[PDB]
Amino acid sequence: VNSFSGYLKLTDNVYIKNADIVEEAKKVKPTVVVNAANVYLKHGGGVAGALNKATNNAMQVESDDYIATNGPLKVGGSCVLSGHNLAKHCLHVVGPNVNKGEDIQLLKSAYENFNQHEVLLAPLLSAGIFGADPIHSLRVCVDTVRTNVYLAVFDKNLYDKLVSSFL
Ligand SMILES: O[C@@]1(CNc2ncnc3[nH]ccc23)CCC[C@@H](C(F)(F)F)C1
Ligand SMILES: [Cl-]
């Protein structure tokens, strides 16, 4: 039993809710919140920009030190950093950004990072400003993640379409 509330159950382990992931994380304080990161951990917009703003830019400061030490992530890769005031940990995961021409096949690799964590709060990877089809992203999530994932979908119109089209 965990403290996530109001989610629809898609599968044994995948759960979905119309919610602002920032407000969800502040309420639940999960062990792991997933960020829709880029390889540079530049958290300018989308989910990443919103999560960073909620940390008063502390996420960006930590991220800049990480990059200065380790260099950029791989597309499809991840790193674990602090969750600041939002969660114990933030798993920064880089899904392909279609608006940069990045291979959508790397989306499965991106979701595989979730399997290293027993429970996660997460957005749909490569959705929103990353330019992929969120219906496809949900399918890859369900077919790749085996651990317990609680998906927050900010857009109510998108949330309703994802449920009604889910096979
Ligand atoms: O959930 C989506 C990712 N973005 C977010 N998800 C959850 N909390 C959030 N807070 C701020 C941003 C955000 C999935 C792709 C479409 C995207 C869009 F807004 F464009 F419709 C919504
Ligand atoms: Cl977005």
Q: Which domain holds residue 67?
A: 8-163
Ligand 1 geometric centre to CA of 51 (Å): 11
In a domain, 13, yes or no: yes
Ligand 1 geometric centre to CA of 74 (Å): 22
In a domain, 24, yes or no: yes
The string of DSSP letters for 62-88 reads HHHHHHHHH-PPPTT-EEEEE-TTT-S
In a domain, 99, yes or no: yes
Ligand lying nearest the CA atom of residue 25: 1
In a domain, 1, yes or no: no
The phi, psi pair for 150, rounded to 5°, reads: -110, 105
Number of compact structural domains in the chain? 1
In a domain, 3, yes or no: no
Q: What is the spatial distance between Cα 149 and Cα 145, in angstroms, rounded to a whole number?
A: 8
In a domain, 23, yes or no: yes
CATH number at residue 124: 3.40.220.10
Of the candidates 112, 109, 123, the residue with the CA atom closest to the CA atom of residue 151: 123
In a domain, 2, yes or no: no
Spatial contact of 153 and 119, defined as CB atoms under 8 Å apart: no
Resolution of the solved structure (Å):
1.0
Q: Which atom of ligand 1 is nearest to the CA of 153?
A: 1
